[PDB]
Amino acid sequence: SVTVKRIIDNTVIVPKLPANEDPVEYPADYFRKSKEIPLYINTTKSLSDLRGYVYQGLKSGNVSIIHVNSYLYGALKDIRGKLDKDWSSFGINIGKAGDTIGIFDLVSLKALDGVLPDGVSDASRTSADDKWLPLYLLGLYRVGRTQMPEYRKKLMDGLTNQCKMINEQFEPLVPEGRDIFDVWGNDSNYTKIVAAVDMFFHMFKKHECASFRYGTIVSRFKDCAALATFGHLCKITGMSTEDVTTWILNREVADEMVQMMLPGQEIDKADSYMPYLIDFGLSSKSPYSSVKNPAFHFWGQLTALLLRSTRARNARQPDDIEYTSLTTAGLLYAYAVGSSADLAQQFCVGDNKYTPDLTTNAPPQGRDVVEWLGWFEDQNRKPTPDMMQYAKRAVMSLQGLREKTIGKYAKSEFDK
Amino acid sequence: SVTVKRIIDNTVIVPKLPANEDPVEYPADYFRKSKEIPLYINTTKSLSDLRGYVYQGLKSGNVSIIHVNSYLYGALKDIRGKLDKDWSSFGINIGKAGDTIGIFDLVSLKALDGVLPDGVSDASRTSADDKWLPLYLLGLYRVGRTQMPEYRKKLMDGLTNQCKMINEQFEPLVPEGRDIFDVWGNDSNYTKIVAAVDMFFHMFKKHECASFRYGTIVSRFKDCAALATFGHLCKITGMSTEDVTTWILNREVADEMVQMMLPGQEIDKADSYMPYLIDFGLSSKSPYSSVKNPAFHFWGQLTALLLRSTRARNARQPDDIEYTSLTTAGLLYAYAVGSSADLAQQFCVGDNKYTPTNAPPQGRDVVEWLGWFEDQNRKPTPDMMQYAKRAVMSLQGLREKTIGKYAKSEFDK
Amino acid sequence: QPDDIEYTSLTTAGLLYAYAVGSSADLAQQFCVGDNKYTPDDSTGGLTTNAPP
Numbered sequence: 001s002v003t004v005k006r007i008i009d010n011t012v013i014v015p016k017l018p019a020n021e022d023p024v025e026y027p028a029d030y031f032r033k034s035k036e037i038p039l040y041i042n043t044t045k046s047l048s049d050l051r052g053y054v055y056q057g058l059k060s061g062n063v064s065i066i067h068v069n070s071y072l073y074g075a076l077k078d079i080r081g082k083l084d085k086d087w088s089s090f091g092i093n094i095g096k097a098g099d100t101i102g103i104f105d106l107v108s109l110k111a112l113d114g115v116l117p118d119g120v121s122d123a124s125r126t127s128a129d130d131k132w133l134p135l136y137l138l139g140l141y142r143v144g145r146t147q148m149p150e151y152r153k154k155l156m157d158g159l160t161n162q163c164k165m166i167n168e169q170f171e172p173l174v175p176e177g178r179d180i181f182d183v184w185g186n187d188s189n190y191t192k193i194v195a196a197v198d199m200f201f202h203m204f205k206k207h208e209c210a211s212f213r214y215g216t217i218v219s220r221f222k223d224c225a226a227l228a229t230f231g232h233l234c235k236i237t238g239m240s241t242e243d244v245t246t247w248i249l250n251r252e253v254a255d256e257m258v259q260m261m262l263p264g265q266e267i268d269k270a271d272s273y274m275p276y277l278i279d280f281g282l283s284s285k286s287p288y289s290s291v292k293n294p295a296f297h298f299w300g301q302l303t304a305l306l307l308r309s310t311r312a313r314n315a316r317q318p319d320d321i322e323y324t325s326l327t328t329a330g331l332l333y334a335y336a337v338g339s340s341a342d343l344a345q346q347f348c349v350g351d352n353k354y355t356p357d358l359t360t361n362a363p364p365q366g367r368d369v370v371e372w373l374g375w376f377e378d379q380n381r382k383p384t385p386d387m388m389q390y391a392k393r394a395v396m397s398l399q400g401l402r403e404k405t406i407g408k409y410a411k412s413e414f415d416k
Numbered sequence: 417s418v419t420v421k422r423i424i425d426n427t428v429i430v431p432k433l434p435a436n437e438d439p440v441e442y443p444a445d446y447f448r449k450s451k452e453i454p455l456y457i458n459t460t461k462s463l464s465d466l467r468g469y470v471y472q473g474l475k476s477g478n479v480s481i482i483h484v485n486s487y488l489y490g491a492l493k494d495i496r497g498k499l500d501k502d503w504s505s506f507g508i509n510i511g512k513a514g515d516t517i518g519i520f521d522l523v524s525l526k527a528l529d530g531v532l533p534d535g536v537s538d539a540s541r542t543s544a545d546d547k548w549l550p551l552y553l554l555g556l557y558r559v560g561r562t563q564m565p566e567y568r569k570k571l572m573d574g575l576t577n578q579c580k581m582i583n584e585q586f587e588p589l590v591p592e593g594r595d596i597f598d599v600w601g602n603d604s605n606y607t608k609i610v611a612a613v614d615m616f617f618h619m620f621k622k623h624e625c626a627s628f629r630y631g632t633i634v635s636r637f638k639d640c641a642a643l644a645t646f647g648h649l650c651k652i653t654g655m656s657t658e659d660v661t662t663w664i665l666n667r668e669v670a671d672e673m674v675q676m677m678l679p680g681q682e683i684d685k686a687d688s689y690m691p692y693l694i695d696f697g698l699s700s701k702s703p704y705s706s707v708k709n710p711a712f713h714f715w716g717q718l719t720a721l722l723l724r725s726t727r728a729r730n731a732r733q734p735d736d737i738e739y740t741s742l743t744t745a746g747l748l749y750a751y752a753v754g755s756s757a758d759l760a761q762q763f764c765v766g767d768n769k770y771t772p773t774n775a776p777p778q779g780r781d782v783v784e785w786l787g788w789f790e791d792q793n794r795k796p797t798p799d800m801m802q803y804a805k806r807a808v809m810s811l812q813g814l815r816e817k818t819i820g821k822y823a824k825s826e827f828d829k
Numbered sequence: 830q831p832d833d834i835e836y837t838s839l840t841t842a843g844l845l846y847a848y849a850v851g852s853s854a855d856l857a858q859q860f861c862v863g864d865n866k867y868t869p870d871d872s873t874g875g876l877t878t879n880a881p882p
Contacts, residue, residue, distance in 0.1 A: 254859035
């Protein structure tokens with residue numbers, strides 16, 4: 001369809017629209033450029049003074065982001081954890097046989113020299129270092145990302161978890177709304193610390209300080225939600241990863257899948273840098289994000305919902321996608337799984353159920369794509385009363401779903 | 417299914433997703449490595465002063481866990497243990513013959529360096545040792561195993577029994593909200609003490625101080641819930657462990673059963689280290705939990721629910737499992753049991769009663785019910801649906817994310 | 830909604846467009862394992878004429 005023409009006067013129109021580049025960048029195609037990830041905190045100001053600096057800063061005022069980072073590195077220099085195996089990611093070989101590494105065995109540099117107050121601060125604070133302060137300092141990042149009234153529920157998390165034979169109270173004054181400690185999310189260094197801490201304790205799960213993960217955990221697979229719904233779609237359909245792939249029926253959902261599965265990205269690998277691609281600054285734009293995989297995210301989450309997913313109901317409904325087309329695809333998929341139970345005898349006493357055995361129009365026995373596409377073709381490509389009912393049965397009795405979710409989308413579509 | 421290829425251009429895609437670590441850890445495999453459970457009682461100095469340290473530390477919002485540990489050790493020297501026969505678990509010989517063993521016949525060691533207040537605290541309290549103080553201290557653990565207003569309706573349990581043959585009352589400061597004695601369960605050495613206590617009085621039910629289990633019992637089979645639901649299902653169906661097993665109809669419920677039934681783990685033995693696999697630090701990821709057995713937990717508890725179980729109502733509904741397939745399975749099982757009543761004559765007066773299209777099968781046999789399910793083109797019958805309807809309608813206030821709420825939504829419409 | 834336009838004609842046109850796209854779902858097997866559904870076979874026009882295009 002290169003040439004379109006106005007039929008009334010035989011003249012040629014050339015239909016075109018505004019371009020939208022915004023390309024994505026992969027973790028691997030960064031280590032092809034630099035073999036290390038810098039962390040700048042040039043502050044050789046004593047640990048005990050940094051301790052006091054931030055304490056009164058947090059109590060009330062302009063807590064410097066330079067200050068908190070400097071403290072954290074010093075407070076977390078605990079060269080803990082014996083490598084049990086080997087630790088290699090993207091060529092970088094940090095961990096050997098039985099080597100004792102730490103956080104900041106990532107890679108680390110020093111920049112600038114300007115600071116706020118004078119050397120010896122206020123010697124009021126005891127240790128309370130490795131004890132609680134970092135858990136607070138790191139815990140605030142997670143609280144910073146939210147904007148909904150969950151901030152108070154996630155600040156209860158902070159305070160209640162910080163009582164590990166420590167018992168204190170609050171610290172800042174004004175409630176959230178992105179302004180106070182949310183400045184930190186935009187610091188290249190602060191996020192890299194958050195990531196290194198998560199990575200490190202994800203390796204050494206058993207470790208007396210792995211409690212630092214609460215709050216440092218939301219950096220893991222940060223804006224890689226599309227990948228997460230692919231995992232989730234598998235566990236709900238109970239199908240293999242490849243068998244789920246074959247049920248993808250829309251061009252733009254295939255596209256996104258190809259993009260999400262591009263090789264050499266270590267996405268399936270145990271302890272890789274991949275899950276921390278954003279906060280380590282390995283990538284400016286995630287190829288695994290929901291905003292770059294909207295067709296897939298909607299399809300998968302819809303399908304999961306009709307299958308009684310509890311989480312899917314609150315997933316966001318993305319704009320600029322082929323709703324009607326994506327939903328019919330989902331229904332069929334959901335209907336196939338949802339009506340064909342796996343159900344086979346597993347254990348016996350020498351007495352097994354032999355399975356030996358409506359030939360015209362009737363839903364196919366198994367859960368095979370080619371079987372179903374042919375059956376649907378027979379229903380001239382339009383969903384039956386039964387499968388339209390199946391969708392209704394599933395969505396009715398869903399209560400209190402927020403707007404712009406796939407939950408409200410699904411109910412409003414199938415509950416008539 | 418090794419290879420997938422995009423049909424539009426004939427290129428191979430390789431579908432893959434992020435990994436899950438956390439393998440299970442078995443209590444047997446612990447005694448493969450070590451041959452002992454080390455209890456680190458750090459300080460060993462003055463029993464009388466410790467009695468003072470605790471009370472004072474309990475009246476205000478500050479008391480060391482090291483100090484209450486060292487106190488428990490000193491106060492509980494019930495070397496009174498007249499063995500009935502023998503006692504052996506996981507290759508470890510705990511006792512034999514008619515030996516009088518003690519509570520701490522489970523390997524004791526010394527630890528670090530630091531202690532809080534000066535030597536002689538307050539010589540105020542006496543003879544309160546082998547009476548109530550342990551019973552109280554130990555009681556606070558199961559009080560720490562909560563988050564909702566259950567605590568203030570479970571600290572009653574405390575003062576009430578902390579009064580039987582002792583008469584003592586109110587002592588705590590801050591009510592709750594993860595602050596007070598709710599941190600004690602974090603101490604590796606504290607939990608080990610509670611475990612050693614419950615394990616001891618489980619062998620010696622008829623001892624003077626059997627009361628002490630009133631807070632230490634919640635340790636027994638901790639994080640081994642899926643194993644219990646298997647027991648509950650048996651009691652509820654009236655069927656044997658063998659038979660129940662055959663009614664498992666999904667691959668993932670099979671794996672999880674297989675992983676729960678590994679042969680060298682003393683799970684059915686009377687007095688073992690297994691039921692305290694967590695608090696003794698034997699395992700850090702129980703194989704018998706309902707997080708490692710999500711499929712089985714749902715299945716078992718849903719079937720229970722249709723069979724009129726009261727406890728099934730509030731069971732938690734796991735994420736990332738095949739709801740639809742599992743639900744069908746549970747429905748068929750529950751339907752079989754719930755329309756094939758055992759019903760046989762039990763007693764007589766010389767006068768017995770011998771028992772011998774597209775209608776539900778005779779007995780409770782899986783092969784038979786599967787064949788009947790086949791004949792119904794693999795979809796649940798409208799009578800089956802009414803059965804589950806009846807079983808769920810008129811269920812009162814049920815909370816969110818339970819299999820109770822799940823079942824009513826699914827079957828009552 | 831702007832003024833001074835032909836609502837009736839514009840909407841009946843917009844309905845017809847919406848109806849067409851909305852009833853003719855894309856749907857086509859994208860990935861496979863060496864086993865692909867091929868859609869045409871004798872694909873005629875549903876129930877006589879007046880059937881959905």
